[PDB]
Amino acid sequence: GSMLYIIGLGLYDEKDITVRGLEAVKSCDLVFLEHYTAILQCDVAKLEEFYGKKVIIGEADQILEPAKTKNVALLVVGDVYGATTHSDIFVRCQKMGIEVKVIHNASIMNAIGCSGLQLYRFGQTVSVCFWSEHWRPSSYYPKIKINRDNNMHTLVLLDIKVKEEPPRYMTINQCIEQLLEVEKEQHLGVYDEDTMVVGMARVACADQKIVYGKMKDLLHYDFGAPMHCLLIPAPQVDDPELDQLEYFKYKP
Amino acid sequence: GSMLYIIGLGLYDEKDITVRGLEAVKSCDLVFLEHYTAILQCDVAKLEEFYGKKVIIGEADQILEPAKTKNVALLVVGDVYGATTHSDIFVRCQKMGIEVKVIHNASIMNAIGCSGLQLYRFGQTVSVCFWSEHWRPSSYYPKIKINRDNNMHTLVLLDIKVKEEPPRYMTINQCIEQLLEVEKEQHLGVYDEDTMVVGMARVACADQKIVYGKMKDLLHYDFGAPMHCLLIPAPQVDDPELDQLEYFKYKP
């Protein structure tokens, strides 16, 4: 019978899909890509003949209405839950009596392990947003304070805007700028200019870039194309963690 | 030239490897499985003709000495970093001048998202160990306190012993028992008998089992074969999170 397949594509290119994921794609009558998938390092035409199927790039009932009768696949960058954006889909499916099958893959949340920081030591994940006129939210700030006061690392996820018009990805540079301005305005002493942090670009991709250095140094560092994120280590870093970070130390 | 490939297999069966991962396996001269991989729901002979290669089941220089000259693959359950057990390998490789290539896959750390709990709200991850005579460690306990005092969820990873002789996996039952005994002995009021928690067995497998209920009720619940883990929600759970958990509510 009918089924909605939500399938994690991994983080880099078309080869990061699982065998299971490739099989569901191939069994499905319709295959949708979350637009966010344009960030993957493949092009759509090559992807289509890698699947042997036509793919649809995408509010939308165009995915769920067919799913009421046919096997439909939705393809998302990373991991279904790892992304956590896809929570409204589950609810909409429940509301409409559609069975959902999740196929898991790599997530930025585990992948950042390549920094050398221990993943068990990560506290809660925070999001930095694009500021706009009077809208200058800094809700993440007190949560970073909690992570640091309690000796946990922080993963800082950065914003992704679509609307005007091409998608604008927040950079590590703009992220550090905003964090420095919030500390200046709120002065709780959570981090500063000289705090050693980890800028990460294109995690789990071939041209992955990782730099460990001061906020003031990473502020002006060129990290290249998105996706970017930031790691703010706990105030104490284990020697084995420091030994790995040192490989990415900033110069000159 | 030579290369050590560390490849995440995913969480369920042979079909959870990525396409990239399958390609590296096939390009490698030698393929090793971490013994921990016996938990996967496939058998070795079927796996071998799925790869078209012979596989070696495994302290050990047998993996790295060849890697000094040949492309060698090490296969691990889940994600390389997601597991975090594999930190000593990286160091040993550094010591010996071996280039390492990580291939990412699903991890229990993202996969537990199927509970309905928001992954950004997870604090630090904790491990419960098998108690032995006078060795009764409870280091995880104060860390659970921090997560809960600061309104974060906890992932509780359970122990896996090998030595005497077949591998003994800790159950949710034995986990809850120990947690209840530690609270009785330490009485900081972190959780109790009536605290609603999430028992999870075989995450991301076809016979995945998820139960949401009281510690006293889950203590005697039969969860089946390993792997097991426990989720201890923050003291406040969002309505949308509660709506998902309710699907797994315990009866009768």
DSSP letter assigned to residue B20: H
Could you tell me if B4 and B64 are in contact, meaning their C-beta atoms sit under 8 angstroms apart?
yes
Instruction: Give A128's Cβ-side CA count (13 Å radius).
Output: 26
CA A205 to chain centre: 13
| Total number of domains constituting chain B | 2
Q: What would the DSSP string read from start to end of chain A? A: --EEEEEE-BSSSGGGSBHHHHHHHHH-SEEEE-GGGGGSSS-HHHHHHHHTS--EE----TTHHHHTTSEEEEEESB-HHHH-TTHHHHHHHHHHT--EEEE----HHHHGGGGS--GGGB---EEE---BTTB---THHHHHHHHHHTT-BEEEEE-EE------EEPPHHHHHHHHHHHHHHH---S--TT-EEEEEESTTSTT-EEEEEEHHHHTT----SSPEEEEE--SS--HHHHHHHGGGB---
Cα separation, A182 vs B229, whole angstroms? 38
Question: Is the Cα torsion angle B205, B209, B215, B219 positive or negative in sign?
Answer: negative
Phi, psi of A156 (to 5 degrees): -105, 110
- Token match 């426990």: residue? B230
Same domain as A140, residue A114: yes
Domain that holds residue A158: 107-252
How far apart are the CA of B143 and the nearest CA of chain A, in angstroms? 9
Question: Is the Cα torsion angle A18, B10, A227, B6 positive or negative in sign?
Answer: negative
Strands A126-128 and B196-201: unpaired
Same domain as A140, residue A92: no
Residue type present at position A214: K
Same domain as A91, residue A133: no
For residue A66 the two structure tokens come to: 């067919």
Nearest to B81 among A16, A102, A114 (CB): A114
Nearest CA in chain A to B115: A81
Element (H, E) at B179: helix B172-186
CB contact under 8 A, B10 and A18: yes
Contacts of B111 in chain A (CB under 8 A): 79, 81, 104
Cα separation, B245 vs B251, whole angstroms? 13
| B236 and A CB contact within 8 Å | no
Nearest to B118 among A8, A11, A84 (CB): A84
How far apart are the CA of B95 and the nearest CA of chain A, in angstroms? 12
Same domain as B229, residue B120: yes
Breaks (C-N over 2.5 A) in chain B follow: 58, 164
Same domain as B140, residue B66: no
Contacts of A119 in chain B (CB under 8 A): 81-82, 84, 109, 125
Beta-carbon pairs below 8 A across chains A and B: 141
- Three-class DSSP category at B161: strand
Could you tell me if A128 and A180 are in contact, meaning their C-beta atoms sit under 8 angstroms apart?
no
Nearest CA to A24 out of A4, A10, A44 is that of A4
For residue A182 the two structure tokens come to: 């919030």
Contacts of A127 in chain B (CB under 8 A): 120
Nearest CA to A152 out of A240, A251, A235, A64 is that of A235
How far apart are the CA of A71 and the nearest CA of chain B, in angstroms? 18
Terminal alpha carbon distance of chain A: 61
Domain CATH code at residue A101: 3.40.1010.10
Instruction: Give B250's Cβ-side CA count (13 Å radius).
Output: 20
Could you tell me if A3 and A30 are in contact, meaning their C-beta atoms sit under 8 angstroms apart?
no
Nearest to A124 among B113, B120, B125 (CB): B120
Same domain as A136, residue A111: yes
Nearest to A84 among B10, B113, B150 (CB): B113
Nearest to B120 among A84, A102, A105 (CB): A84
- Three-class DSSP category at B22: helix
CB contact under 8 A, A15 and B15: no
Cis? peptide before A152, omega within 30° of 0: no
Contacts of A86 in chain B (CB under 8 A): none
Separation in Å, CA B74 to CA B30, B107, B131, B205: 9, 17, 31, 22
Counting beta carbons within 10 angstroms of the beta carbon of residue B221, is it exposed (0 to 12), middle (13 to 18) or buried (19 or more)? Answer: middle
- Token match 């998302």: residue? A76
CA B22 to chain centre: 22
CB contact under 8 A, B120 and A110: no
Separation in Å, CA A48 to CA A16, A21, A44, A71, B233: 15, 14, 6, 18, 41
| B246 and A CB contact within 8 Å | no
Strands B154-158 and A160-161: unpaired
Same domain as A161, residue A60: no
Angle at A74 between CA A70 and CA A78, to 5 degrees: 155
Could you tell me if A191 and A232 are in contact, meaning their C-beta atoms sit under 8 angstroms apart?
yes
CB contact under 8 A, A8 and B106: yes
Cα separation, A30 vs A45, whole angstroms? 16
Strands A56-57 and A30-33: parallel
Same domain as A92, residue A10: yes
Contacts of B16 in chain A (CB under 8 A): 18-20, 104
Contacts of B120 in chain A (CB under 8 A): 84, 124-127
Domain CATH code at residue A217: 3.30.950.10
| A64 and B CB contact within 8 Å | no
For residue B64 the two structure tokens come to: 């790295």
CB contact under 8 A, A16 and B11: no
Same domain as B177, residue B77: no
For A228, residues 6+ apart whose C-beta sits below 8 A from its C-beta are A158, A169, A170, A171, A172, A175, A199, A200, A201
For residue A51 the two structure tokens come to: 């699947």
CB contact under 8 A, A106 and B104: yes
Counting beta carbons within 10 angstroms of the beta carbon of residue B163, is it exposed (0 to 12), middle (13 to 18) or buried (19 or more)? Answer: exposed
For residue A52 the two structure tokens come to: 């042997």
Same domain as B178, residue B88: no
**Facing residues of A56 across strands?**
A32
Same domain as B119, residue B152: yes
Technique behind the model: X-ray
Strands of A100-103's sheet, edge to edge?
A: A56-57, A30-33, A71-76, A3-8, A100-103
How far apart are the CA of B155 and the nearest CA of chain A, in angstroms? 9
Nearest CA in chain A to B20: A15
How far apart are the CA of A105 and the nearest CA of chain B, in angstroms? 4
Boundary residue ending a domain (B106, B121, B144): B106
Task: Tell me how crowded residue B207 is: count the other CB atoms within 10 A of its CB.
Answer: 10
Contacts of A81 in chain B (CB under 8 A): 110-114, 119
Phi, psi of B34 (to 5 degrees): -55, 130
Cα separation, A219 vs A221, whole angstroms? 6
Counting beta carbons within 10 angstroms of the beta carbon of residue A143, is it exposed (0 to 12), middle (13 to 18) or buried (19 or more)? Answer: buried
How far apart are the CA of B111 and the nearest CA of chain A, in angstroms? 7
Boundary residue ending a domain (A59, A84, A106): A106
For A93, residues 6+ apart whose C-beta sits below 8 A from its C-beta are A4, A64, A67, A99, A100
Task: Tell me how crowded residue A249 is: count the other CB atoms within 10 A of its CB.
Answer: 10
CB contact under 8 A, A91 and B124: no
Q: What would the DSSP string read from start to end of A126-162? A: EEE---BTTB---THHHHHHHHHHTT-BEEEEE-EE-
Residue type present at position B151: N
Boundary residue ending a domain (A54, A77, A106): A106
Task: Tell me how crowded residue B224 is: count the other CB atoms within 10 A of its CB.
Answer: 10
Same domain as A226, residue A123: yes
Phi, psi of B233 (to 5 degrees): -60, 155
| A239 and B CB contact within 8 Å | no
